[PDB]
């Protein structure tokens, strides 16, 4: 199951340290996406509707590189 799908706080705390990622939080829309998704009014459709907005896509793609210990196979 989604056991190691959960990220360790170290990796998450590194997000705020990332000059690139923190700069994304400067977007009033992006931060609204974040808080909306967390409240979970309907995370089901939000997870879809958020991946279409380039702002949240940037945020997502940025946090992945910071929290993913997963190497790029054989790159």
């Amino acid at each position: 199951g989604p056991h190691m799908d959960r990220v360790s706080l170290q990796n998450l705390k590194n997000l705020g340290e990332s000059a690139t990622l923190r700069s994304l939080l400067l977007n009033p829309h992006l931060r609204q996406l974040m808080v909306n998704l967390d409240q979970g009014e309907d995370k089901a459709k939000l997870m879809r509707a958020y991946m279409q907005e380039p702002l949240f896509v940037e945020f997502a793609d940025c946090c992945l590189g910071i929290v993913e210990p997963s190497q790029n196979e054989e790159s």
Partner: protein, 34 residues
């Protein structure tokens, strides 16, 4: 993998909101029915 990635975003978002914005703890099993 998007199945993994999207859930990973949930960890990212919730961490930030936790020390940046509100820091609230609404997502808890405060139900005393159990």
């Amino acid at each position: 993998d998007i199945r993994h990635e999207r859930n990973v975003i949930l960890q990212c978002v919730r961490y930030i909101i936790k020390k940046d914005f509100f820091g609230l703890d609404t997502n808890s099993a405060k139900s005393k029915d159990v």
